[PDB]
Design a protein around this motif. Structure first.
Motif, short mmCIF file in Angstrom:
data_model
loop_
_atom_site.label_atom_id
_atom_site.label_comp_id
_atom_site.label_asym_id
_atom_site.label_seq_id
_atom_site.Cartn_x
_atom_site.Cartn_y
_atom_site.Cartn_z
N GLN A 236 48.24 23.97 44.68
CA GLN A 236 48.76 23.89 43.16
C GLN A 236 50.09 22.82 43.31
OE1 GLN A 236 48.16 27.41 40.50
NE2 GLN A 236 48.75 28.38 42.31
N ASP A 280 45.06 32.50 42.96
CA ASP A 280 46.21 31.72 43.46
C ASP A 280 46.66 32.53 44.92
OD1 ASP A 280 45.91 30.21 41.15
OD2 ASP A 280 47.97 30.57 40.47
N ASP A 293 48.16 35.64 41.56
CA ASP A 293 47.47 35.42 40.27
C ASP A 293 46.20 35.23 40.49
OD1 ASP A 293 46.94 34.62 37.47
OD2 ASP A 293 47.49 32.46 38.17
N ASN A 295 42.60 34.44 38.51
CA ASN A 295 42.12 33.74 37.45
C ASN A 295 40.52 33.75 37.42
OD1 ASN A 295 44.62 32.27 36.55
ND2 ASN A 295 44.41 31.59 38.66
MG LIG Z 1 48.44 30.76 38.48
#
Ligand SMILES: [Mg+2]
Ligand SMILES: Nc1ncnc2c1ncn2[C@@H]1O[C@H](COP(=O)(O)OP(=O)(O)O)[C@@H](O)[C@H]1O
Ligand code: NA
Ligand code: NA
Ligand code: NA
Length: 387
Positions: A236, A280, A293, A295
């Motif tokens: 990221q 994440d 996190d 998703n």
């Molecule tokens: Mg994230």
């Protein structure tokens, strides 16, 4: 060579736009939200996508023609809020479609019975407060979820750096609903932001800020015929406050990082999840894994990983850029660099749809080349020509 239409039924229609009705923790620019509607166009394949008119102009066709692609014929266009919401209703009622939302919309736009994936389950899977429910209780930073009335007394017990996140059912993404605090001045700003969002905030996640050495988005896919499949991982590119800018490719993801993500994917699948997911996963200096996190949906790094067969594997940088003011120079500089071979176009929001330079054009792409130094020099030269 997986595509999204391999994972969703023939009656599903996809929208990656945030609702026109924002919330304080997902408030991107109206043009940023429109720019997002075309992000997954190249991996959608047979899946129809709801796209703003300005996101599928001739400018996009020119950029796709260079890499030998077409703009999918299975797109539905809109040009404002009323046509967007009317399109969604008409698709579900007249066309008997099911709508896949990247971010939930309110029930008055579309009743939950027309969601492609069960809305209650989708909200629960993508609820940051409920992450430990999906990780078998592992991989999380030191954290506590507190009601907003207790936040003031609780926050005093925490040392910097820390992260505060909304702990309710509102959609969030891209760093629009994360408050990373490194000192009291950061906390003072966060407290004011939370106070201005009192109407929409019932609880807050307080989380230790991990001093990460790596920040992966580890992706998986599931369908009844495919099983659970590892798609790869991306690094990221997020700034000091967690704002999402893009992704880099990865070469050697640790085995235990992949296995942490797979176990999370299995827990979601066992509850009814299907499609693409991306988790994440941070790694600290002692190689501990942190799930910060989840998703349970596609995201930006999905295009990078599903299009890996068409990109140089040495170094990749997925990123977005805005016009400096001159949309014509913006597009012609982009089109020039796409023809040079090391710039893969993904999406284009044509600001000249609104008139000559009245709105900033936006471009999502992947830089790809043999070495990182050569790629970054190519990006730096592209940015210099834009002044
Ligand atoms: Mg994230
Ligand atoms: N507990 C944490 N420790 C360290 N960094 C964090 C933490 N939480 C968030 N971040 C940083 O903030 C970014 C965005 O936060 P995230 O929880 O992923 O929200 P979003 O839903 O916007 O992706 C992450 O990519 C990471 O860089
Ligand atoms: Na996210
Ligand atoms: Na970062
Ligand atoms: Na998420």
């Amino acid at each position: 060579n997986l595509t999204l239409s391999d994972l969703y039924d023939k009656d599903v229609v996809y929208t990656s736009r945030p609702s026109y009705i924002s919330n304080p923790w997902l408030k991107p620019d109206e043009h940023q939200s429109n720019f997002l509607t075309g992000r997954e166009l190249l991996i959608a394949n047979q899946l129809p996508v709801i796209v703003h008119e300005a996101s599928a102009t001739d400018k996009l066709h020119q950029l796709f023609q260079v890499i030998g692609k077409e703009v999918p014929n299975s797109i539905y266009t809109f040009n404002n809020q009323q046509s967007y919401e009317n399109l969604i209703k008409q698709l579900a009622h007249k066309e008997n479609k099911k709508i896949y939302f990247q971010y939930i919309h309110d029930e008055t736009i579309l009743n939950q019975q027309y969601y492609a994936l069960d809305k209650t389950l989708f909200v629960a899977l993508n609820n940051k407060a409920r992450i430990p429910e999906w990780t078998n209780g592992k991989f999380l930073p030191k954290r506590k979820v507190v009601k907003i009335e207790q936040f003031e007394n609780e926050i005093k017990n925490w040392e910097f750096p820390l992260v505060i996140k909304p702990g309710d059912d509102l959609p969030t993404a891209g760093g629009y609903g994360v408050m990373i605090c490194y000192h009291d001045a950061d906390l003072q700003k966060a407290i004011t932001r939370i106070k201005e969002a009192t109407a929409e905030t019932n609880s807050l996640i307080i989380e230790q800020k991990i001093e990460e050495k790596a920040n992966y988005c580890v992706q998986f896919a599931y369908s009844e015929s495919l099983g659970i499949q590892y798609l790869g991982a991306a690094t990221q590119l997020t700034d000091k406050y967690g704002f999402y800018n893009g992704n880099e490719n990865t070469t050697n993801v640790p085995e235990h990082v992949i296995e942490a993500g797979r176990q999370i994917m299995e827990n979601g699948v066992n509850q009814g999840f299907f499609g693409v997911a991306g988790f994440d996963l941070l790694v600290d200096e002692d190689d501990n894994v942190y799930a910060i996190d989840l998703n349970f949906r596609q995201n930006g790094s999905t295009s990078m990983l599903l299009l890996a067969n068409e990109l140089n594997s040495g170094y990749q940088k997925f990123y977005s850029y805005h016009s400096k003011g001159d949309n014509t120079h913006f597009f012609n500089t982009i089109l020039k660099y796409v023809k040079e071979g090391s710039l893969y176009p993904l999406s284009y929001y044509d600001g000249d749809w609104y008139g000559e330079d009245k709105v900033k054009s936006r471009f999502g792409c992947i830089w790809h080349g043999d070495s990182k130094e050569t790629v970054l020099e190519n990006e730096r030269a592209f940015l210099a020509e834009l002044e």
